Design an enzyme around this catalytic site. Structure first.
Site, short mmCIF file in Angstrom:
data_model
loop_
_atom_site.label_atom_id
_atom_site.label_comp_id
_atom_site.label_asym_id
_atom_site.label_seq_id
_atom_site.Cartn_x
_atom_site.Cartn_y
_atom_site.Cartn_z
N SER A 187 23.70 10.66 46.99
CA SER A 187 22.07 10.43 47.63
C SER A 187 21.60 9.35 46.71
CB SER A 187 21.43 11.69 47.59
OG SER A 187 20.15 11.34 47.80
N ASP A 244 24.44 12.99 58.80
CA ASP A 244 23.60 12.40 57.85
C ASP A 244 23.29 10.96 58.35
OD1 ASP A 244 22.45 11.27 55.51
OD2 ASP A 244 24.24 11.63 53.97
N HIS A 286 23.52 15.92 55.10
CA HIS A 286 23.67 15.10 53.82
C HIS A 286 23.43 16.18 52.66
CE1 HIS A 286 22.26 12.01 51.17
NE2 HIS A 286 21.36 12.67 50.58
#
Length: 301
Positions: A149, A244, A274
């Site tokens: 991320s 995601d 995600h």
């Protein structure tokens, strides 16, 4: 297109988590610290150290005849939340799966320390390991970077810094990163209201990290996709998630690298969300996808 994974969906209903700015940074960091997590490979040796002023936590793989490679891990959390403890399990999974000494970096967090504070911290530790890794029992000639991320954005950016300062990285493992800041990519619309990360959160955390950067021509240390050239950085494995909004971000980043001649592997776990490392050892499809990327990085080291 394929359905959201069935076990993942039962988990997401029991503990529905959304990464958002609601209630301010302290409430947000608390929601993320409070998620129940499975302890992963607890036998592994861990140590706390401070490296060039950056707090760090160091993990050792199962001791073997060979001297292990070293991997730097940059935790995610939108550049705002996250810490060594809520990522302890993820770092241990990297250590056992890659067979590497793992250096988890506790970088400075926005909004108190916005861009470029995170970059300076993860880069300082990367410089320190590249010169002092044997002092941990690791091979300084075998180094890689990994991040998820926001930490994936830090990992892609560190690989460009490493290429330009003469630090040899043999690979960069990017878990569902934020390399382009292109909200026009298809997944931002298809997955705008997706389970763990939505399109509002993506825009919110970027603003908290780097509010005062004109994104018409940003520096590459913020947006790695906007570099003059991506040629010469370490080969990439980019682990992307189907549900995601950042899916096409990682896939686009794989395309830009290959167009610049960079070895790049992208894997899409189409049934996951995600941040699927948070389900390692909990959601079977998540462990399997994670173990693929960990194995490729095991070979490259």
């Amino acid at each position: 297109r394929p359905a959201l994974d069935a076990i993942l969906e039962k988990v997401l209903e029991a503990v529905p988590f959304q990464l958002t700015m609601d209630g301010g940074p302290d409430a947000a960091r608390e929601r993320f610290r409070a998620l129940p997590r499975r302890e992963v490979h607890p036998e592994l040796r861990a140590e706390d150290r401070i490296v060039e002023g950056v707090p760090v936590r160091i993990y050792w793989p199962p001791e073997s005849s060979q001297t292990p490679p070293v991997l730097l891990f940059f935790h995610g959390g939108g550049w705002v939340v996250g810490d060594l403890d809520s990522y302890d399990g993820t770092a241990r999974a990297h250590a056992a799966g890659v067979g590497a000494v793992v250096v988890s970096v506790d970088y400075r967090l926005a909004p108190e320390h916005p861009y470029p504070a995170a970059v300076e911290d993860v880069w300082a530790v990367t410089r320190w390991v590249a010169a002092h890794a044997a002092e941990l029992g690791a091979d300084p000639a075998r180094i890689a970077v990994a991040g998820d991320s926001a930490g994936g954005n830090l990992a892609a950016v560190v690989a460009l810094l490493a290429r330009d300062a003469g630090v040899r990285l043999r690979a960069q493992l990017l878990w569902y990163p934020a390399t382009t800041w292109d909200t026009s990519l298809a997944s931002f619309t298809e997955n705008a209201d997706a389970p763990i990360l939505g399109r509002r959160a993506v825009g919110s955390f970027s603003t908290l990290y780097a509010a005062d950067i004109d994104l018409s021509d940003p520096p590459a240390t913020l947006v790695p996709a906007r570099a003059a050239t991506l040629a010469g950085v370490a080969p990439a494995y980019i682990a992307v998630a189907g549900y995601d909004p950042l899916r096409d971000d990682g896939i686009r980043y794989a395309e830009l690298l290959a167009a610049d001649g960079v070895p790049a592997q992208v894997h899409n776990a189409d049934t996951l969300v995600h941040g699927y490392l948070g389900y390692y050892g909990v959601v079977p499809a998540a462990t399997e996808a994670a173990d693929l990327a960990l194995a490729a990085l095991r070979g490259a080291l």
